[PDB]
Amino acid sequence: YNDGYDDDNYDYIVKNGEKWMDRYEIDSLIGKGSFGQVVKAYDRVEQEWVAIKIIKNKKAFLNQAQIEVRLLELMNKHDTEMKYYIVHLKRHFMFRNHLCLVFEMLSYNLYDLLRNTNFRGVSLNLTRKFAQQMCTALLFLATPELSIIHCDLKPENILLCNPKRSAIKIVDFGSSCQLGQRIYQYIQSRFYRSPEVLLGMPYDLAIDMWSLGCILVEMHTGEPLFSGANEVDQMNKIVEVLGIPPAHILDQAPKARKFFEKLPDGTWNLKKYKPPGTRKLHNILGVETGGPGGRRAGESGHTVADYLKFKDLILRMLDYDPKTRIQPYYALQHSFF
Numbered sequence: 001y002n003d004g005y006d007d008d009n010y011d012y013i014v015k016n017g018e019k020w021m022d023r024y025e026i027d028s029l030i031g032k033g034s035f036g037q038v039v040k041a042y043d044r045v046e047q048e049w050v051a052i053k054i055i056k057n058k059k060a061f062l063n064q065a066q067i068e069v070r071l072l073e074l075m076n077k078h079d080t081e082m083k084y085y086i087v088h089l090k091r092h093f094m095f096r097n098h099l100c101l102v103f104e105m106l107s108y109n110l111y112d113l114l115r116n117t118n119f120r121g122v123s124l125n126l127t128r129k130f131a132q133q134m135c136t137a138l139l140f141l142a143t144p145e146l147s148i149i150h151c152d153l154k155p156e157n158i159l160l161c162n163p164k165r166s167a168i169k170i171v172d173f174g175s176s177c178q179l180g181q182r183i184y185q186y187i188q189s190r191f192y193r194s195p196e197v198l199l200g201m202p203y204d205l206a207i208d209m210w211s212l213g214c215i216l217v218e219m220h221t222g223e224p225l226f227s228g229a230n231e232v233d234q235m236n237k238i239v240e241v242l243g244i245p246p247a248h249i250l251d252q253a254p255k256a257r258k259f260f261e262k263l264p265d266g267t268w269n270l271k272k273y274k275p276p277g278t279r280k281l282h283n284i285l286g287v288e289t290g291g292p293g294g295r296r297a298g299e300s301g302h303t304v305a306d307y308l309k310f311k312d313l314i315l316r317m318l319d320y321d322p323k324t325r326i327q328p329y330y331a332l333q334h335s336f337f
């Protein structure tokens with residue numbers, strides 16, 4: 001495959017210590033996924049370690065990464081001080097039939113961090129730090145010259161800069177789009193997928209705020225908020241917590257009847273779970289009962305008052321109506337922060 005350079009998965013066969021382009025010394029593989037691989041490499045010209053994302057030698061993967069490159073170039077252009085929590089693309093090149101994206105080197109992702117908590121969650125204080133950085137990133141993506149919808153926010157796409165610190169960067173803009181050029185109908189990883197997407201309705205940057213609300217709950221509890229096995233199960237899990245979506249939304253939803261049925265009195269119910277709205281976020285978070293699993297009882301930084309502010313912000317991020325769902329500017333002003 002590829003003159004011996006590739007495996008049968010379209011991946012470049014990594015070789016420890018290989019020199020590329022009279023510039024990079026490849027050290028080791030540090031991550032992998034559907035897109036290809038990420039290697040740690042020494043950039044001998046800039047005298048620093050870098051992460052090189054080696055995209056698969058396969059046209060669909062190449063073109064996904066070309067979208068990613070263009071969006072990163074647009075963003076990084078408007079954030080030269082690296083202050084808006086978006087990963088920094090240093091440069092890119094084609095090498096041995098692989099598109100290669102050279103990034104700053106990052107640490108663990110937030111799913112890795114959840115595993116490191118034994119799936120019991122990070123503290124409310126650390127959750128708040130992640131939330132503030134993520135809302136700042138979403139404010140930046142919403143600036144009009146960007147208008148970027150990430151479209152795949154989830155713990156695995158948020159990386160720590162350093163294992164010992166709370167600073168983060170968002171990665172993976174290969175599935176992203178811009179408000180002016182929305183093309184996709186099928187988007188978002190299932191657990192983090194917004195109701196408007198499930199319902200086949202128009203969408204905008206608010207879909208990323210929905211995902212963020214789901215992510216932040218999971219960061220503190222250790223477990224996904226809405227862990228659907230398929231779209232019907234996903235919507236039913238959302239409904240357990242948040243109730244039946246508003247009629248004015250379902251009346252306009254192309255896929256309303258995948259999940260719901262309209263009664264003679266005009267109201268909507270589920271098609272034949274805990275009853276709608278009875279799995280309270282108040283209890284998932286343990287607002288009055290010592291946090292998730294009661295494990296935060298007797299800990300500082302986890303008061304009822306604190307939890308009530310967190311609950312309020314999350315419920316605003318999980319508004320069914322994308323027009324009234326909280327937006328980044330206002331999330332940042334919320335009393336949780």
Ligand SMILES: CN(C)c1nccc(-c2c[nH]c3ncccc23)n1
Nearest residue numbers: 031038051103104105106107171172
């Ligand atoms: C999808 N993905 C994993 C991805 N997409 C874009 C950038 C990065 C990335 C940048 N620096 C890193 N350092 C260590 C590990 C990964 C990365 N990872």
